[PDB]
Design a protein around this motif. Structure first.
Motif, PDB file in Angstrom:
ATOM      1  N   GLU A 239       0.812  -1.234   0.000  1.00  0.00           N
ATOM      2  CA  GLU A 239       0.000   0.000   0.000  1.00  0.00           C
ATOM      3  C   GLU A 239       0.839   1.274   0.000  1.00  0.00           C
ATOM      4  O   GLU A 239       0.410   2.282  -0.557  1.00  0.00           O
ATOM      5  N   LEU A 240       2.025   1.211   0.618  1.00  0.00           N
ATOM      6  CA  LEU A 240       2.875   2.382   0.837  1.00  0.00           C
ATOM      7  C   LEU A 240       3.883   2.660  -0.275  1.00  0.00           C
ATOM      8  O   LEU A 240       4.237   3.816  -0.505  1.00  0.00           O
ATOM      9  N   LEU A 241       4.368   1.607  -0.938  1.00  0.00           N
ATOM     10  CA  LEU A 241       5.380   1.759  -1.990  1.00  0.00           C
ATOM     11  C   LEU A 241       4.898   1.394  -3.392  1.00  0.00           C
ATOM     12  O   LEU A 241       5.645   1.545  -4.358  1.00  0.00           O
ATOM     13  N   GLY A 242       3.669   0.881  -3.494  1.00  0.00           N
ATOM     14  CA  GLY A 242       3.118   0.391  -4.765  1.00  0.00           C
ATOM     15  C   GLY A 242       3.741  -0.899  -5.306  1.00  0.00           C
ATOM     16  O   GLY A 242       3.257  -1.454  -6.304  1.00  0.00           O
ATOM     17  N   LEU A 243       4.809  -1.373  -4.656  1.00  0.00           N
ATOM     18  CA  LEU A 243       5.503  -2.602  -5.064  1.00  0.00           C
ATOM     19  C   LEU A 243       4.603  -3.821  -4.915  1.00  0.00           C
ATOM     20  O   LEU A 243       3.613  -3.782  -4.188  1.00  0.00           O
ATOM     21  N   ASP A 244       4.982  -4.899  -5.599  1.00  0.00           N
ATOM     22  CA  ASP A 244       4.166  -6.087  -5.770  1.00  0.00           C
ATOM     23  C   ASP A 244       4.754  -7.248  -4.970  1.00  0.00           C
ATOM     24  O   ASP A 244       5.895  -7.657  -5.196  1.00  0.00           O
ATOM     25  N   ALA A 245       3.969  -7.794  -4.046  1.00  0.00           N
ATOM     26  CA  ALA A 245       4.385  -8.981  -3.295  1.00  0.00           C
ATOM     27  C   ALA A 245       4.796 -10.140  -4.211  1.00  0.00           C
ATOM     28  O   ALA A 245       5.624 -10.981  -3.819  1.00  0.00           O
ATOM     29  N   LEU A 246       4.241 -10.168  -5.427  1.00  0.00           N
ATOM     30  CA  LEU A 246       4.676 -11.129  -6.462  1.00  0.00           C
ATOM     31  C   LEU A 246       6.151 -10.978  -6.847  1.00  0.00           C
ATOM     32  O   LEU A 246       6.760 -11.917  -7.359  1.00  0.00           O
TER      33      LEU A 246
END
Lengths: 315, 316
Positions: A239-246
Motif C-alpha cells: 500500500e505504501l510503496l506500490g511494489l508487488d508482493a509477487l
C-alpha cells in the motif's frame, strides 16, 4: 589474525570431511541414493546481517540447501566461502558462524570445505558469504518445469513477500522473515505422483518463477490476484510503496506445479506441516502462451517482470 | 533491466548443456563413478587487487585456482559453479573482459560452468568485483595422494619457480617489465604423474606459498622437513623483489606451482616427467622428509635452521 578466524570455522563446523586442498566424498553412497547430482551455488550480501527471523549465516545455509532440495534431493554436503572486512567485530562473526553451524546441524548437512578472504576497511561491507551445495536426486523423482502442460495447477506454500518486506521495512524505516530450510516440507511431496515442478522463489519472487515456468514448457500461466496469500503487514508495504508482493524475495516459500487431479492431495499435505500452513492454489497452466494476472471481474492482463531494479542487498 | 543484462552476459558467455536449468545443475552420477570412487570438491573466493595483471586476471584466476584445488587430488576437473559479487557502476567493458577470460579458460581446460549466481551491491560496498568458484571431479580409485602417508627419506620437489605471482602483484601495488604471474591450470601437468607409483603427496602453493605447504606436510605426517635454500628456483626478477623488500619467495603466493612429495627412488623419474611438459620445465628437488620433527632451512655451510611461518592483503 588469519588462523584465529580459520580456527573458528574448523571448531564450529567440525566433521570428518574437514579434519588438504579439497573435500573427498563417497561417490558410491551418492549413486545409491540417486542417478543425478544436484549442484547449486548462491552468494549472500544481505544488509543488515541480522534481522527479524534470521541472519546472513542461517540464510546462507537455507538458500543453498533449498536450491538443492527443490530438485527432490536431500542436501548432504555444503561448501562455504567467506569474505570479511578487516575490523569486523568477533562477536558478530561468532554469532554468524554459530547460526550457520546449528542450521546445517539441524538439517543434517555437513560443511565439508571452505575458504576465507579478508579485505581492508571499505573494500567490502562487513561480511559476504558464498555457499555451494549438493545432494543426489532419487531416480524416480522427475520434477521439472519442462513437463508442464495445460490444465496443471499452480500452488504456493505460504504467504508471499515476508522476507523482502521485512528487509524493506528495516532499511527504509517504515513483519518477520520466513527464512527456513525447506527439505522437511518438500519430502512430504516426494511420495505424491502428481507433483510436476518445484522451485523456490527468491530473487524476482513468484513472478520470476512463473515466467520461468511458462518459458520452460511453452504454455501460458494464469494467476488469480485475489487468491494470492499476503499477510496484512506485507499488504502494508504494498500500500505504501506500490511494489508487488509477487516480486518480493522469499526465503522459505515454494512454487509448486501439480497435475490437476492432485491439487487437493498436495494442499492437504502442505497444510499438515508447519512450513506449511498457509499454502494456497493461485493459478493454472493454460494453452495460450504468456503470463497473465486475473483482476476484478475476471479480467486477465499480462503480468510483466518489473522494469525497475529492486532495493539492493535484500539477499 | 541491469540484472537481466548482467544475467544475459553470463548465460551467453558460459552457455553449455547444463546451464541451458532451474534452481540447480543436474550432473550424471554414473559417469562420475565410472571415473573414480571419490568426488573431489573445492571452493575458493577471489578478491585480487588489481583485476588485471601481467599473466592474467581475476577471471582466469578464478578458474585456475579452483580447478587446481580439484586436480591436485588426481581428479580431472569437470564442473564449476560460479558466484559474482559486483560493485554498482562497475564498467561493463571490465566485467565483459573478465567474463570472457573466465569462459575461455574454462573452455580450454575442458570445464563446464554449470551453475551460478550474481549479486550487485551499492558503490562503496565492494571493491569492483569478487568471484567465488566451487568445483568437482572424480578421483581415480588407484590414486591415493596425501601428506599423512609421508615418511623419512621421501623427497620434496617443486614444479617450477617460486614467487612469480606474489611478486608480480606486490610490484604493481607498490611500484618497485620482468615480472609475470604464473597463473595456469595444472591438470595437464598433474596427469603426467598419474601413473607414477612413487608419488605420495601433491599440493598447490597459493596463500602462504610453499612455506605453508611444507608446514602442513610436516604436521600431517609425523616428521620433519628440511629445505635447501640454494636449491630453490627463483627467477631473477623475483630475487629483485626479495632483495628490495626482504620478503621470502617461500612465502609468496604461487598460482601455477605444485609442491610434490615422492619416494626417494622415484625422484628422478618424476623430475623427467615434469621436465617434459611446458609447465613443467623449471622443476627442482628442494628437500627431504626426515625423522627429526620440525621445518628447517639449510643456509650457508649446511646450517639447518628452523623455518618459521611469517602479508599484503588481496594478493589472491
Amino acid at each position: 589474525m588469519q588462523q584465529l578466524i580459520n580456527s573458528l570455522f574448523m571448531e564450529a563446523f567440525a566433521n570428518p570431511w574437514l579434519a588438504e586442498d579439497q573435500a573427498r566424498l563417497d561417490l558410491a553412497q551418492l549413486v545409491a541414493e540417486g542417478d543425478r547430482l544436484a549442484f547449486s551455488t548462491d552468494s549472500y550480501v544481505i544488509d543488515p546481517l541480522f534481522f527479524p527471523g534470521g541472519n546472513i549465516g542461517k540464510l546462507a545455509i537455507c538458500g543453498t540447501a533449498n536450491d538443492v532440495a527443490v530438485s527432490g534431493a536431500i542436501p548432504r554436503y555444503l561448501s562455504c566461502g567467506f569474505i570479511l572486512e578487516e575490523g569486523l567485530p568477533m562477536e558478530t562473526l561468532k554469532a554468524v558462524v554459530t547460526s550457520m553451524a546449528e542450521t546445517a546441524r539441524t538439517a543434517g548437512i555437513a560443511i565439508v570445505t571452505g575458504d576465507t578472504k579478508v579485505v581492508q576497511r571499505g573494500a567490502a561491507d562487513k561480511l559476504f558469504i558464498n555457499t555451494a551445495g549438493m545432494g543426489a536426486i532419487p531416480t524416480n523423482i522427475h520434477w521439472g518445469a519442462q513437463t508442464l502442460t495445460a490444465g496443471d495447477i499452480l500452488l504456493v506454500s505460504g504467504t508471499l513477500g515476508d522476507h523482502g518486506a521485512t528487509i524493506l521495512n528495516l532499511r527504509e524505516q517504515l513483519l518477520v522473515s520466513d527464512c527456513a530450510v525447506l527439505t522437511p516440507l518438500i519430502q512430504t511431496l516426494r511420495d505424491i505422483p502428481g507433483v510436476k515442478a518445484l522451485r523456490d522463489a527468491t530473487r524476482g519472487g513468484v513472478n520470476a518463477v512463473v515466467h520461468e515456468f511458462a518459458a520452460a514448457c511453452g504454455c501460458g500461466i494464469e494467476i488469480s490476484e485475489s487468491a494470492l496469500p499476503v499477510k496484512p503487514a506485507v499488504r502494508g508495504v504494498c500500500e505504501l510503496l506500490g511494489l508487488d508482493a509477487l516480486n518480493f524475495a522469499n526465503e522459505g516459500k515454494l512454487v509448486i506445479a501439480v497435475e490437476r487431479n492432485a491439487a487437493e492431495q498436495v494442499l492437504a499435505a502442505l497444510h499438515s506441516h508447519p512450513l506449511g500452513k498457509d499454502a494456497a492454489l493461485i493459478g493454472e497452466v493454460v494453452e495460450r502462451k504468456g503470463v497473465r494476472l486475473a483482476g476484478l471481474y475476471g479480467v486477465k492482463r499480462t503480468l510483466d517482470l518489473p522494469h525497475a531494479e529492486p532495493l539492493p542487498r535484500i539477499c
